[PDB]
């Protein structure tokens, strides 16, 4: 297993950020990569073992630390916008080639001049089009989250209390709609017969990862902390 913390982070330029990687595979080699929309997965720093780190391909602006076999940290002394990215960690046995590696869940890191742009999302649910709700035989619900920033959100569908992945059609990635505003959507298809049953319960769960305690927010306005908003609806 490979874990990373935090999994979401909004930082202010020139600040210090520390992404942490924990492994339980007892592998000697650990890595730190970054992924950029359109571009590839690049190696920043890596380690052959405790007490040592090695410069990857794009080491500039990053420091690494291997306090032990289990832990590998990526330190960003002076955070800058160019460092906005999705970071991936990975442990590796043997020679440490891809087939021998195991990656972490990834970490979204966004660096801004100030955190006053950070905003939670607006979530809305939509009933199927009258058209499809006749000569369609299939009812399709639409869940739309928008107006949020940065793009640290998750959208999940729940019917009758249990999660559902069948029929769900979430957008691959949050499409930006304005400089400081993202937008994501997802559909849930069921049989009209099912959608018309007053007993069935539809719920769109959306989670937005926002500022944390460590994050300092200008008093007065409500600190845009993480949100767990949900749009629900019954049959017919």
């Amino acid at each position: 297993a490979v874990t990373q913390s935090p999994r979401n982070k909004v930082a202010v330029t020139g600040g210090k950020v520390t992404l942490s990687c924990q492994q339980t595979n007892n592998h000697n080699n650990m890595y730190w990569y970054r992924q950029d929309t359109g571009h590839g997965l690049r190696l920043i720093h890596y380690s052959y073992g405790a007490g040592s780190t090695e410069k990857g391909d794009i080491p500039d602006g990053y420091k690494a630390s291997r306090p032990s076999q289990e832990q590998f940290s990526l330190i960003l002394e002076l955070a800058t916008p160019s460092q906005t990215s999705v970071y991936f960690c990975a442990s590796g046995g043997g020679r440490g080639s891809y087939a021998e590696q195991f990656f972490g869940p990834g970490t979204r890191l966004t660096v801004l001049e100030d955190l006053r742009q950070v905003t939670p999302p607006k979530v809305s649910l939509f009933e199927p089009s009258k058209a499809e709700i006749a000569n369609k035989q299939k009812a399709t619900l639409v869940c739309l989250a928008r107006g949020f920033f940065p793009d640290h959100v998750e959208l999940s569908w729940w019917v009758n209390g249990k999660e559902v992945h069948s029929g769900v059609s979430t957008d691959p990635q949050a499409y930006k709609e304005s400089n400081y505003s993202y937008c994501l959507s997802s559909r849930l298809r069921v049989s009209a017969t099912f959608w018309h049953n007053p007993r069935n319960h539809f719920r769109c769960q959306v989670q937005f990862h926002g500022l944390s305690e460590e994050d300092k927010w200008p008093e007065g306005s409500p600190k845009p902390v993480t949100q767990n908003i949900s749009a629900e609806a019954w049959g017919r």
Partner: peptide
């Protein structure tokens, strides 16, 4: 001053 990488103490068991 100890080091860990390339520290073969045995064949298996490590740490």
């Amino acid at each position: 001053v100890e080091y860990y990488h390339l520290c073969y103490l045995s064949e298996n068991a490590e740490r």
